[PDB]
Design an enzyme around this catalytic site. Structure first.
Site, short mmCIF file in Angstrom:
data_model
loop_
_atom_site.label_atom_id
_atom_site.label_comp_id
_atom_site.label_asym_id
_atom_site.label_seq_id
_atom_site.Cartn_x
_atom_site.Cartn_y
_atom_site.Cartn_z
N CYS A 42 0.83 -1.19 0.00
CA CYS A 42 0.00 0.00 0.00
C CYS A 42 0.87 1.26 0.00
O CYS A 42 1.69 1.43 0.91
CB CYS A 42 -0.90 -0.02 1.26
N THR A 73 -8.76 -0.24 8.56
CA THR A 73 -8.08 0.58 7.56
C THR A 73 -6.57 0.78 7.88
O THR A 73 -6.20 1.06 9.03
CB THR A 73 -8.76 1.98 7.45
N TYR A 137 -5.04 5.52 -9.51
CA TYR A 137 -6.22 4.75 -9.12
C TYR A 137 -7.45 5.14 -9.95
O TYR A 137 -8.20 4.28 -10.41
CB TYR A 137 -6.51 4.88 -7.60
#
Lengths: 297, 297
Positions: A42, A73, A137
């Protein structure tokens, strides 16, 4: 479950979280209370890991590695004893590591967010965030051809702006590495490996953008950056997990990554990764090293 | 429905197909009897289109454009009056265009398959066929990670062999363009645009392989090659049609193709696309031009 409490210097060690006028709570900086929960794949988490290493916070905030969520998260700071999530607001995490945790930094640690640059830095980082960090993204997860086309155009206007900005400055904000570079690196280091093909962002490879490629190599070869970058876990996560984009779940063997270790040529712009007298990070803690090192790592 | 009849010079015009000992039939070369049925996207078909243009067979064999099948079978030669498929054996189609259709070539047309090179050419073309032409498909359609890994390795051993072969020769078989180049070009010209990402073949872009990239540009800029290459129909076919690989059916905006038109630097190896005295193709027939030209086409 967006959580934007903050860990700060002006709440004392051992204290309960302290209610603020804005409805949030402020927790105290102290050693041995909190854990950084991150994921190798990530990019948002990668910022927090790089900053933790650069500043020498590895012996005072522990590290848990898990799977990504933005693509609990992650990244998050978690109170170890209670497992409560203190914060998942990743922009304030790295700013606060720099400014609130100062007394716990390694002696001689760099000043990554200096007072005199903060004002000019803000718009540069915002532009990078919307057009590049998120830009990949928006390009990759586009739901129609039209949405792809627009997102791609935005991404490349910004990458061409960066290529030009870095033609006259060694790093984003001049002679030394700052927070801005720590927010850009995680996108660039995943670009040829994943975003180029998987997210269809490939107008060009970063290897074909001379200033960005020199910059990327210069950062990669700096402590905190390459030694927290696991190319196998990055590629496996995107190519295997995003079955709606890549149903075969095959991970390409390429690209060849050996270029990351080659001379970058950026010394011609002057400057240096860190200011004079800054100390380098100590040995990476046992268990926190890259599990899948390339031959050059 | 593999059909390997042949159209030959030693069967006379107007004849019915003539039975051969091997069970096939031989048909007569003549003008106005046969149609080449091809597809812009298909590399195997692309060979036949390039050869038809180079030799000046456009006014004696007609052209039908349809969709790909190898990724009726295309390319095929079809008898216009009866619609019978004469042949879909694409290797013999281009050899026969060169050797059997000689009296119908444009005066001064090149000798693309010269007697003295045929023996050395055979293994070179076979290696290109199994490891490169098909190599990209075996990489892209691999059914497991293991199958991807092996196919990728084979492809790159062969591309590195080609890069080295073309370091000392202008084209595959020396100073001038031959059949071998016509069989390699269709793979290379689709590589950065499609195979690199869509088929996960991207160790490197062709733009990063200096000899292959110089060679690719040199060929692209030659009549018959670039003027039969429609990048839009190539990308649309692969990215939209192969829904088992790319379910979103989105076509990437990239790569930037503008490099195809830049100076190639291959004159330093001597030679020339065609031998001295060879004539160039005449104007491309109305209706056969690239429908989606790039700004440099």
């Amino acid at each position: 479950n967006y959580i934007d409490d903050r860990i700060v210097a002006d709440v004392p060690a051992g204290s309960e979280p302290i209610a603020q006028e804005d409805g949030t709570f402020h927790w105290p900086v102290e050693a041995g209370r909190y854990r950084l929960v991150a994921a190798r794949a990530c990019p948002w988490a990668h910022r927090t890991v790089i900053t933790r290493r650069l500043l020498g916070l590895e012996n005072v905030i522990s590290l848990g590695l898990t799977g990504p969520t933005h693509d609990i998260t992650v990244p998050a700071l978690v109170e170890e004893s209670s497992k409560k999530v203190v914060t998942n607001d990743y922009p304030s995490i790295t700013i606060d590591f720099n400014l609130e945790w100062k007394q716990f930094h390694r002696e001689g640690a760099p000043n990554l967010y200096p007072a005199e640059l903060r004002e000019e830095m803000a718009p540069v980082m915002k532009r990078i965030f919307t057009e590049v960090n998120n830009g990949v993204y928006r390009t990759g997860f586009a739901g129609s051809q039209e949405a792809h086309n627009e997102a791609y155009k935005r991404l490349w206007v910004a990458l061409d702006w960066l290529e030009d900005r870095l033609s006259t400055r060694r790093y984003l904000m001049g002679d030394h590495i700052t927070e801005a570079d720590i927010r850009l690196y995680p996108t660039l280091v995943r670009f040829d490996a994943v975003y180029h093909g998987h997210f269809k962002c490939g107008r060009n490879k970063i290897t074909e953008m001379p200033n960005l490629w020199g910059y990327l190599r210069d950062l990669f070869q700096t402590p905190g950056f390459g030694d927290t970058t696991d190319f196998t876990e990055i590629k496996q996560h995107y190519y295997i997990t995003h079955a709606e984009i890549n149903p075969t779940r095959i991970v390409p063997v390429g690209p060849d990554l050996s270029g990351f270790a080659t001379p970058h040529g950026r010394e011609k712009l002057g400057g240096s990764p860190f200011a004079e007298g800054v100390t380098l990070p100590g040995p990476i803690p046992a268990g926190e090293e890259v599990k899948n090192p390339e031959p050059f790592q």
